[PDB]
Amino acid sequence: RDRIPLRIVRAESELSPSEKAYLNAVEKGDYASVKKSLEEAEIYFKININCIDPLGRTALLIAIENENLELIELLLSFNVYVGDALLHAIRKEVVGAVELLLNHQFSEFTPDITPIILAAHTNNYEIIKLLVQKGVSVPRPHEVRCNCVECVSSSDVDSLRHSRSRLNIYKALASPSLIALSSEDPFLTAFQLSWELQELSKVENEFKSEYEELSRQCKQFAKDLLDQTRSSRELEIILNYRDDLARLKLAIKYRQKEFVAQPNCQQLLASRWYDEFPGWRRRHWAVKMVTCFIIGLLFPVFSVCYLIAPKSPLGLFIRKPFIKFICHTASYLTFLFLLLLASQHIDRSDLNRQGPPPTIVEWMILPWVLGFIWGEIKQMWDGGLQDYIHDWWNLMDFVMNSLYLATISLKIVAFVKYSALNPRESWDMWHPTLVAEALFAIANIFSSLRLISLFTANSHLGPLQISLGRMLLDILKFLFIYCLVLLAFANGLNQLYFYYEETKGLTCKGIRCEKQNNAFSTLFETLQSLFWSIFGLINLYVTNVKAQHEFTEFVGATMFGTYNVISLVVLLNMLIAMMNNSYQLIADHADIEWKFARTKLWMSYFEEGGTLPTPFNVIRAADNLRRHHQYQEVMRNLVKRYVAAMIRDAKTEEGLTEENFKELKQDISSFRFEVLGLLR
Template sequence: MAQLYYKKVNFSPYRDRIPLQIVRAEAELSSEEKAYLSAVEKGDYASVKHALQEAEIYYNININCMDPLGRSALLIAIENENLEIMELLLSHSVYVGDALLYAIRKEVVGAVELLLNYRKPSGEKQVPTLMMDTQFSEFTPDITPIMLAAHTNNYEIIKLLVQRRVTIPRPHQIRCNCVECVSSSEVDSLRHSRSRLNIYKALASPSLIALSSEDPILTAFRLGWELKELSKVENEFKAEYEELSQQCKRFAKDLLDQARSSRELEIILNHRDDQSDELDPQKCHDLAKLKVAIKYHQKEFVAQPNCQQLLATLWYDGFPGWRRKHWAVKLLTCVTIGLLFPVLSVAYLIAPKSRLGLFIKKPFIKFICHTGSYLTFLFMLLLASQHIVRTDLHMQGPPPTIVEWMILPWVLGFIWGEIKEMWDGGFNEYVHDWWNLMDFAMNSLYLATISLKIVAYVKYNGSRPREEWEMWHPTLIAEALFAISNILSSLRLISLFTANSHLGPLQISLGRMLLDILKFLFIYCLVLLAFANGLNQLYFYYETSASEEPNNCKGIRCEKQNNAFSTLFETLQSLFWSVFGLLNLYVTNVKARHEFTEFVGATMFGTYNVISLVVLLNMLIAMMNNSYQLIADHADIEWKFARTKLWMSYFDEGATLPPPFNIVPSPKSVWYLCKWIHNQLCPGDDSDNEQKRHENLKTFTERHADNLIQNQHYQEVIRNLVKRYVAAMIRTSKTNEGLTEENFKELKQDISSFRYEVLDLLGNRKPQRRSYSTSSTEVSQKEETNEDNAGEKPRAKSVSFNVANKKKDFNVSALIKTMSGINMVEEKPKSNGISKRSFVRNGNRVQRLSSSKKESFKRLGLLFSKMNGHVPEPSSEPMYTISDGIIQPHYMWKDIKYSPMDREREENCSKSEINLNEVAYSGNTRLTGQSKECPVVCTSSLHCASSICSSNSKLIDSSEDVFDSWGEACDLFINQWKDGQEDHVTTRL
């Protein structure tokens, strides 16, 4: 079992234990680096700044170090949304890396803007990319900032990036076979697919489309359709592409939701995407955008209430208040108009511009007239099937009856209507509509029936008993085809059900179930063919002739079924009808006593019935139930989309007259035909042609100007819709967001940062517990213990530096910004890198902290009173410590002794802001009364203080309430300090 973890080891002391060890250890952080990252995490600005300054001098901290989670200090600041620390880190040239991507993913807008405005200084030494852990990066190499921002769909961040003119790679076509796509797929197919998915995921961002697209609605249409097609090719990422396609559809629908008036709706739905096409003034309400939506199957967009409201207004034009009328009034009106369709059609043929001619052109009236015409056609088919006009049934080539002559104009009208539809819409659009395919089959059957009847009438003249006709007689075939066409014609009426809200969803469900039946038949035919082949192979040898069977009948249609599996075709029929229980079990018997053959045949027949009835048939029922449920769940959208397709077929110009009146040439058509013939036969002279060219140019200019005006209006409406959509999206996101864990983290971070800021202002911060020794470039950490009492709590760790002998005469910098309210203002730096600083007092801060400053200097007076004025001798190797205190320059002390009164005062004092050494405070520790010799202190350090002892430095405690008697010592110290620092204060380490 241990081998499952790692290789076998021999150091395990127990045989029944699995030894565990870290096999993928990471580099450990030093204590300074941990403190540095912890300060960034807590929002401690002062500590972070102090650590960065020390890192520039001593190189004791790697400012680009990472925690166990792979986060650098910059990433931690981004996660906590601490922009002040971010700015501080960037000012010290920390490695940026994927910080911008990280900020975009966290959706920290301020951090993104800060990183975008950040410019690396020239000559900056950044950490090379190869030195960083690229495999630990959370982002793939193909991810760019704009792509990640689009993935998060953050409008503000996307706007910041788009304003800087960023770009996104253009994806190739779905089935692109270029060298780039082929080579990329061969090298790394997973990366190629993932890269394509990331690009499309970015392009499908609603915020990006709204910002960067001139026509966001059309862009959403095309992109949604492309993603839907791509899901069929990239089967591995089918769910992702379908979700992106649905996202584009929702965006287009939500954008249309923001329309507030019918004028805006008309401008949107009537806009043409292709401005190169001339806009016919007569087609100003052709709903071009809605046609594009239907073409790309944008069901949510089409079923949107605003769109349906406009469609209903156009559909019931001329019938105000139609929906509020009683159903009986509606029925009576429809029946009346349906019966009058011949009168209206004749009126349109005679006078197209008359009142009746314009009335029949309305979409709703056109629909009623076409429906009435088709119902009349079905009624005549019913009359033809009832044989009201009797003819000689034994005549081989009968002439057409009166009813058949009446049916012929309707058939010709249907054929002419289909030809015009194919010519106007194109072949591809025509074949994509299943009802058109059904119409094509129906018309083809009628044409075949008419042709066969003509052949029979010409070829066969006499009468002959029908029983003696050959099987393939033209009249028999014509009658069979006419019967099939009657069925299709009756079923074609189902397409009109979509106009009704109750029958429409049922009709859509029926169409979806037909697809399930086709899928089922594919599997069923495979099973049927497999068992038919096996049974035919088994029973082929036992075939009998018709004379050997009772009543000379052979096959399964006989009273006593026989030879059910003798041929392959007969076997297929037998197995098919067995599904409906029309086949007996004794068909598996044979006349010979071959029980084994009968057993195998019966077993195969029973297995087929189990598979077909129990498995496949129930699977078909489940599939049909699922399809119906899908339609039922989206019944409103599916029905409105289907109804819109039906309505749009009547909004178009043309096809005004129903069959059979559509085959009658109208005066307008005759005039156009005569004019065209005249132009072809008698072309005009040059002057007429020149005049026509001028007229055409004028017309083209006017139409082009209209296009520009309409496009400008469309852009204004789209701009308003986008603004409303973005505002609604932001409101919705804020409403749905609520209180999350991120909100509590942000609140905790703000409180932590505020805590450290308050401590800095009040001067109650304890500095880091460090002392520096050994050398200026080597850092060592050691644990100090109490030498006096071994049982007491040990002291905290200190980090010390030993500095080589330098110039003994140094100036001392005194920086007590947090205590005294004195701000440092940098002036022009000197050549040695030492900044000349001057003290500038902040009035407000002095007022707040004047008492604190006064008490701080008084505490220093207590310090000097304890030292008794003794100055230590200089040492050859100076030792200094980093602290935040102020000491008098050019002075040292030694032989320090404490009086009993001083001990008593020290015990009654509380913690002070002034720390001579960064050593942990112990509550039971007392200052020793022995005098100890101390080395010379480096008085020019930034945070330099006098060392009371080389190994043990004491934290001076002072009370918040200082005696007034210490004021003189404090004043004496201030005067001495001013004498040495009149011009400026230098800072040197």
């Protein structure tokens, strides 16, 4: 044998020539031929009414695909096995599914698929409304964090079916047409559904993209729903609705970035940000800088008026959120400026004083440290503990405050434990004064690096700062890989060099001086020398041995050279490849991320909790019924126009497929035969 004898292996049962003509008449829309053949079948029992084409299409399915309502009615007049024809009509999005609804095995749909679930998948408003008008219900899925005995038992029996059924239910519930129809509050339903779908993607490692797409679709629906507001009164009603912008705060907690960054939503927020401050967005940039500078210089007098004279014209200026931000920023700059003055030695503090009294500059630095702690305490008071620890900057603030407390405690300890004359060069090296200065210096770095969080307010540094933060997570991933490589070579280099590098009597012991002696004596020294070789600060004589062991020296330098190639040529250049690719993904929708972050910064100054800056902070049924009606009224309009604008128009702008061409031939072919039948 030299040829492949192709043969039918599975295929399907063949069709009689009469049956093939009968199905061909259904495809061609020949009503007279189909009616005659069906009448002959019920009187001669020759052909099978429920014959199946090679592609798996029966007579009813062919008529449904061509949307020949007359043919469907003719077939339904006889005893045609409907089977899953209703699902096929729903999937094909044929509005003439009413005939199958009120009409007194191998399936292309899973057994868990119901007409309502499939209708919601198709996102057809007319079909969904038709089914909901009748008796229709959807099985309710269990929570993401569920421990039901039935849930685990069902998954154990069939894991594939359980996952598919759960995905199908959530796909049906996430359809905007179903939410706009059967949901009491579609804005709240979309917020909760996106949260649940996002949690499912994290829990279900498989089908992560499907769940993420469903959550993104829910987030998009809420943004499109809010896009239908045409008056500022409607926007205020929706955003302030609660069961203060309570609904806007709810959207923030659900990470509805698209909803928050809506142009109308941002415009209203900017009005609250610049309340009673007209023309700020139209002034020159030089005027803006001058006005902000003079306002910031007068932050203490504004806080003094707020404390002394409430509800006063001078005390009402600070209540503006924009003025709060400027005054708070000006307070932080003064604190940072005082930190620079502390290192500048404005007042004499001597050098040999073991326990020094606090400097005059440090004396008025202390209220800011107490104010920062006082403000952080109130952050956990008015706000929830879950939200307090969510922010990354909150952890950074806690570290800075902890370092400041240790500095104050060590300064107090040194004051009350050391009161004798002793030159600095002959101290303990673990002196409380030395540790206090070290922790103060570290806290100064964190205090000055806190100004990055203020970049969100600016329109130019805002999107950049957010992008760098979102890209820092990629650096953390290479910290694991580099450290594993760093520890691998540090282990090898220390193992080789710890015999010879036992030299004593030198001025130094390590790498941090002119004569770098013991680069790989210990594991700690090996790690430092390997770390500093990235920047080229480790010379080549660190691999030398006093003994004339050139083979050991060559191996050590080759191991040092291999690390340099891997870390610098390979790892560093690989790191660049990620962040360049990472930014291309982050560059798009970077405005949405910044606007969401800027909104959170803006609403942090809306309330009265932190009106005072850091240094000076230490010194029903009828109304509820009315709001529900006015929210439902407004929401009725939004859903109605959303359906007309998005659901209807997008379907009209949909592209043309082969089914439409196949359809157009059927109407011509149906008009083809009866005109010939009528004329002849």
